[PDB]
């Protein structure tokens, strides 16, 4: 769709490499470590999808 079709997504980063035939349903925000992240944040705490 022209400027649409958002229903298809993929994870850019993860806490660790996914195991064979694994599947992570959760979409929790990755932790940055250098700063607390409970809400949205910057460098590493972006929405993984």
């Amino acid at each position, epitope marked *: *769709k*022209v*400027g*649409g*079709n*958002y*229903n*298809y*997504l993929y994870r850019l980063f993860r806490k660790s490499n996914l195991k064979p035939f694994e599947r992570d349903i959760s*979409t929790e*925000i990755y932790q940055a470590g250098n700063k607390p992240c409970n*809400g*949205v944040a910057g460098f590493n705490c972006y*929405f993984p*999808l």
Partner: antibody, heavy 123, light 107 residues
Framework: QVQLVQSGAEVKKPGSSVKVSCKAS????????ISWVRQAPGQGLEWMGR????????NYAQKFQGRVTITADESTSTAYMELSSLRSEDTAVYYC????????????????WGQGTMVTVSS | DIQMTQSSSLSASVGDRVTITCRAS??????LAWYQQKPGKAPKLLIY???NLETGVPSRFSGSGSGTDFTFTISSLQPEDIATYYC?????????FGGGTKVEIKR
């Protein structure tokens, strides 16, 4: 569980700007996507635009760009809608609904709807 | 641009079968939905995939068709069917809805 609530009715002069919004209650602002759709008296539903609060992507209909502007935030968790240089024909009720096409292989349908915001224009 | 036309007003008694279609100029890739709505109220989604019903709506409501055609159907009318129904296209970004077919309980 997700549910939406809209603002109250409004009345203003032609040629002015009208501001209306809807609360992104239930679920989370990150796992939610909002889209505004117009329904005029004597007409079916009609699209105004879409906004994904977490992605920040927005678009409009080919006949309401500029005339209509869309914005959203997380501090308030709501989609902001502003219609400028509104005509007298802009007297209609605006809806704010959930955009399902945002995640997990769903499609561009509206599973949850708000109540409705009636905007009337008269002298 | 893509558009549609529902075909506008109906009247039926409890128990009979009714069918409605929303034609279009170009083949919609089965990306069509149908809503229930009282005139001037928040609609309720019934059909989102051409052959899959949403949670909460009974099997009494149904639909069929694919491509450049579709047909919404109620296997049997009931007094709760006093409302209008809207055919919606979502094949592309410029979302558009139908004019809305209205079926009235027939006395």
């Amino acid at each position: 569980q997700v549910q939406l609530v809209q603002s109250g009715a409004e009345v203003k002069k032609p040629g002015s700007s009208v501001k209306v919004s809807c609360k992104a209650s239930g679920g989370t602002f990150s796992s939610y996507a909002i889209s505004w759709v117009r329904q005029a008296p004597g007409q079916g539903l009609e699209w105004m635009g879409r906004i994904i609060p977490i992605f920040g992507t927005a678009n409009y209909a080919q006949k309401f760009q500029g005339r209509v502007t869309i914005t959203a935030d997380e501090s308030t968790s709501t989609a902001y809608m502003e219609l400028s240089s509104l005509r007298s024909e802009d007297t209609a009720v605006y809806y704010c609904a959930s955009l399902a096409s945002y995640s997990s292989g769903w499609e561009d349908v509206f599973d949850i709807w708000g109540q409705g915001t009636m905007v009337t224009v008269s002298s | 641009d893509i558009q549609m036309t529902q075909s506008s007003s109906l009247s039926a008694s409890v128990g009979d079968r009714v069918t409605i279609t929303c034609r279009a100029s170009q083949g919609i890739s089965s990306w069509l939905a149908w809503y229930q709505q009282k005139p001037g109220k928040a609609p309720k989604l019934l059909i989102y995939d051409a052959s899959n019903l949403e949670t909460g709506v009974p099997s009494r409501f149904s639909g069929s068709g694919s491509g450049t055609d579709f047909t919404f159907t109620i296997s049997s009318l009931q007094p709760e069917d006093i409302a209008t129904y809207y055919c919606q296209q979502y094949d592309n970004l410029p979302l558009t809805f139908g004019g809305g077919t209205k079926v009235e309980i027939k006395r």
